[model samples]
Target chain A: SSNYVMHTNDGRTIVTDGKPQTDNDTGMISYKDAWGNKQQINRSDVKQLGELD
Target chain B: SNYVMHTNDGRTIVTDGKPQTDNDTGMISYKDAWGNKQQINRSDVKQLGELD
Candidate 1:
């Protein structure tokens, strides 16, 4: 499975196996972290995203 | 004396100083404004750096 990394504006990093979903209306990014925890972040707050190393 | 804080949940804050990381708690803290301390988990930080 492809892993992804999400960088937030707040300087935090999140890694997830599942692809992130962005809400068009709310602009929220949702995904499950590496630990399998459900997570959400604002698209505006995201600095960048890439495949996990 | 100022830094830009980009939080994981989506926030851009101009803080008073570089963010401080608490090794014990895994949290990062910074002064958003004079005397206003803000804290967020390290994992919650998207990108933190000095905005000189």
Candidate 2:
């Protein structure tokens, strides 16, 4: 499994095993956090995505 | 195009491209006008993990 660390523009970070989704309509990046919450972070807000070290 | 970005800081705005960088500098901030596109700087995050 891959773990991606996602962060919201608000400065909160979500470490999860799910890959992010980019919305064509919304132009936003969507993914699931460690808690399985629906995290829709804007692509610009996203710091970056890589396999968890 | 302006970006209406929503953040944990509890803010909203019509903003631009998605990305950020934070460290010795301040938190992620938008240029407010049509300007540069910033990508998320992973160093800002609490945890930076990788796959085995």
Candidate 3:
């Protein structure tokens, strides 16, 4: 099992069991929300929080 | 242009191709300098960036 974490520009931190999907062509990011619903936002809206060892 | 994958284990993988994220498997796939396919768990990656 793995998880990815990031901080959004809106002062929210998002943690997901799956790595957030990124679209280079469109600069968008998609990931599952707290309720397990898929959420998509612009790449510029989030910030990486480093990797887990 | 080249891409760099910094891993949590302290290894930096340089690839000639862009890294692809697979949410289904929670892994990132890329083509190495030797033309070999490589994959690393998304959680194992510290950063993915283009080399200047």
Candidate 4:
């Protein structure tokens, strides 16, 4: 139920249980997928994040 | 645009306008999310077909 939507450079989007907060310790935009699989892509792998409105 | 799973998995069945042909290995196979792929022999699946 996180409000943040992490969009990859292409068209992929991941909005899962937690905010895609960039962890300075891990250097990854970390979050889990729909099935609870930890999906940690490079923090720079994403384009820009906007809004649903 | 290509995948197979349990009848109730609620996912795409195949590539758009593509036939349900076997892969070069000649087994009932399709790729899934970058997570992976494999082959089957039809018995493992139900409600199989293409979609719009």
Interface RMSD of each: 11.3, 9.9, 9.0, 17.8
> What value does the lDDT take at residue B1 in candidate 4?
38
TM-score per model over all chains: 0.45, 0.42, 0.49, 0.39
Residue pairs that clash (backbone atoms under 3 angstroms), model 4: none
For model 3, the stretches where C-alpha displacement exceeds 4 angstroms are A1-53, B22-24
Residue B28, model 2: lDDT of 52
TM-score of 2: 0.42
Model 2: per-residue lDDT, tens digit, A11-38? 7676865677764333356666776655
**Local accuracy of candidate 3 as per-residue lDDT tens digits, A16-41:** 75777775522236566557765445
DockQ of 1: 0.04
- Candidates 2 and 4 compared: the better one by lDDT is 2
Docking class of 2: incorrect
Write one digit per residue (lDDT tens) for candidate 3, span B7-51: 668898887867776545646777889999777766666556566
CA displacement after TM-score superposition, residue A25 of candidate 4 (Å) = 4.2
Q: How big is the positional error of residue A53 in model 2, measured in Å on the Cα after superposition?
A: 3.5
Task: Report the lDDT tens digits of candidate 4 across residue range B1-52.
Answer: 3322333234434422212326465444555445345454443333333232
Tens digits of per-residue lDDT, candidate 1, B1-52, equal: 6666566578888877556654556466667676787677655655444565
